[PDB]
Design a protein around this ligand. Structure first.
Ligand SMILES: [Zn+2]
Ligand SMILES: [Zn+2]
Lengths: 58, 301, 299, 60, 62, 46
């Protein structure tokens, strides 16, 4: 039911996930439960579903 | 008046029979009294019919006091009868039910046994037939459903004596003939005490009924609704798995006739007072059981 | 008090007038003690039931610490009358009152109670202040004060206040009980859940008297159940409801008052706090049986 | 765990036994899974070549 | 393995019994806590929760 | 805009999103009643 927020680190971006009945896959980086990133606050995509937005590193 | 009637005490057969007459006189377009037969000792056997029209509408059968010592059941029957007349046109669920279905309430299924519990032996269970050192038959082992099988006694002296043959007891035969002649019963509820159980078939066999999932779901809901009132815990499941093996029982019979919503209530308590449940617990027992009975009726409609 | 309607919920003025009537009718048995004034200046009243002695071993009973739990104040009103009806008639209760004093606080939180009649029927806390008003008077006692099962947030229902005994409604009782110094039983009456609980709420650590209080609880519950079949469970607060730090009976027990119990009256959540007036007498009657059982084991 | 329902003229007694079975004096005993009332009630083991815990109800 | 929690919220307490999950931060102040009778009776229905499942039920402060 | 629950006192009844139940009876914010004589409404705003 409820939404769980995650923050992921990848070498080239930071991604925020809000998931319902799911969590980010290992391929989506070092992802850990964390408050929704301030810039993350639309499209649910996929055991459940996650919406996600990223910002790049340079 | 049924308004000045004391529902918080145990009554004699005459008082209950007089109550039936009062309630009919007060609600003649809702309730009628039917004599479906005479007991072994010649007492009239009465059913209250609750109806708002139609001809032989889908019906709910409720029997109480088949075992005479289970005094909380007859007392609950009296309360139920009054409740039906109090709630019709006030409660939307119960009005809906009665607007499409009839209810048949047999408050005292075993009138000789009941008279005997007041006159001689408070803890008498059986009918009073002598078909006489060892009087009577267990009216809930007399039905034509696994008759004679484990869970009934071939001994006249035992409390589960099945009798010489199925339907030997006029008290049972009367219900059988009535329900069969009617042909349109959709639910069939037998009310007993005690244990705090809600039971579905079978008692006579470990075989699962084809409607196990549904009846288990209905029992689960009715028990939740019952419990919601005063916090009384009930358990539910087939008779054979939840109390004991019992052959020739009413709801096994009713179910095999095709009456799908066939259930047996075991009311309060779990043994502290047992059959000698105090009068002060009549009303609370009837009130909470009503919620469970109503739940089943809603599922029926 | 014979013409008083016990099957109806009363305002605070009705209950306070009732207390004066009862004292007038029973001057040698009951006296009205004022133990403090509430945050909003309302008198805090305790009914003393006594047949004499000096500093006799005492039973404390408090109701309506949480204002929305109306069944409790109503039960306390019925209890008060019952005590005067049964003294010199019931041999067991007569024996209790010939050896012991009973202190009954019917409305432990009068400001909240006033609020539940006028503004918010479901108010729980005191009315002390803060936009966010009030302290949970049952998180304000000096017994694991501030520990888990209380909130440090003023806006939350279990706000423990700035410090233990910060609430005068709690300090008033603490002062009184400690000054007296000879209380044997301490009973707090709440609703709802149908529970009889013993310490502790603040710690999973068992009390030294677990076995006995468990036996006392078992009897009380069986006695209560016999009237209407009202099903109670029993056990320690923390294992049976939830963790609750700074609670009254954890405090009392730590003062050495062995027979410290909290009742959660009817129901189990159907009407919850909004228990209909029709259940006031039935509740009071069965709860009395449980309470008298604890009193009998106390004597 | 070996369990039985023993049907007597006036009551049904449940038996859960270890290293024993209900004696002939317990009536008409049928191998039977335990019902909830039997689990609620049959709490105390008693010597019985092994031991049984047992509880009864009248016919209800 | 089944783990249980009491989550203390401003207005209520919610029990959680969880498999392969734990209550989310949105559930309030959650303590590992043995299951109480009211929790055991009310928390019946498993629902998918985080990457596992929980059954939950609540009561107000009483 | 999150869900706000109320309890209103014939019967007892509310979970709302951006509104509150109107005087629907004597209503106060309260956790959602467990069941959501003398019946029971399960209602929902807006
Ligand atoms: Zn029976
Ligand atoms: Zn409380």
């Amino acid at each position: 039911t409820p939404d769980e927020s995650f923050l992921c680190y990848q070498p080239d971006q930071v991604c925020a996930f809000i998931c319902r009945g799911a969590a980010p896959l290992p391929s989506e980086g070092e992802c850990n439960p964390h408050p929704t990133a301030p810039w993350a606050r639309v499209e649910w995509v996929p055991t459940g579903q996650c919406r996600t937005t990223c910002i790049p590193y340079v | 008046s049924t308004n000045t009637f004391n529902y918080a005490t145990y009554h004699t057969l005459d008082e209950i029979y007089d109550f039936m007459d009062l309630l009919v006189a007060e609600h003649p377009q809702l309730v009628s009294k039917l004599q479906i037969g005479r007991s072994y000792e010649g007492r009239p056997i009465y059913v209250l019919k609750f109806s708002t029209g139609g001809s032989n509408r889908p019906a709910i059968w409720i029997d109480l006091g088949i075992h005479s010592r289970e005094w909380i059941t007859q007392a609950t029957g009296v309360w139920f009868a009054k409740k039906f007349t109090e709630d019709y046109g006030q409660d939307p669920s119960f009005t809906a039910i009665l607007d499409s279905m009839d209810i048949f309430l047999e408050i005292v299924t075993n009138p000789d046994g009941f008279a005997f519990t007041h006159s001689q032996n408070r803890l008498w269970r059986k009918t009073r037939s002598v078909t006489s050192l060892c009087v009577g038959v267990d009216a809930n082992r007399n039905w034509d459903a696994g008759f004679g099988k484990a869970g009934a006694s071939s001994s006249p002296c035992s409390e589960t004596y099945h009798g010489k043959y199925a339907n030997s007891e006029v008290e049972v035969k009367s219900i059988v003939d009535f329900v069969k002649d009617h042909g349109n019963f959709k639910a069939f509820l037998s009310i007993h005490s005690y244990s705090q159980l809600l039971l579905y078939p079978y008692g006579y066999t470990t075989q699962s009924i084809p409607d196990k999932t549904e009846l288990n779901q209905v029992a689960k809901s009715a028990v939740a609704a019952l419990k919601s009132l005063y916090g009384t815990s009930y358990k539910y499941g087939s008779i054979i798995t939840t109390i004991y093996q019992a052959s020739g029982g009413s709801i096994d019979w009713s179910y095999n006739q095709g009456i799908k919503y066939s259930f047996t209530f075991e009311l309060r308590d779990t043994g502290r007072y047992g059959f000698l449940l105090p009068a002060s617990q009549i009303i609370p027992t009837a009130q909470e059981t009503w919620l469970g009975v109503l739940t089943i009726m809603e599922h029926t409609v």
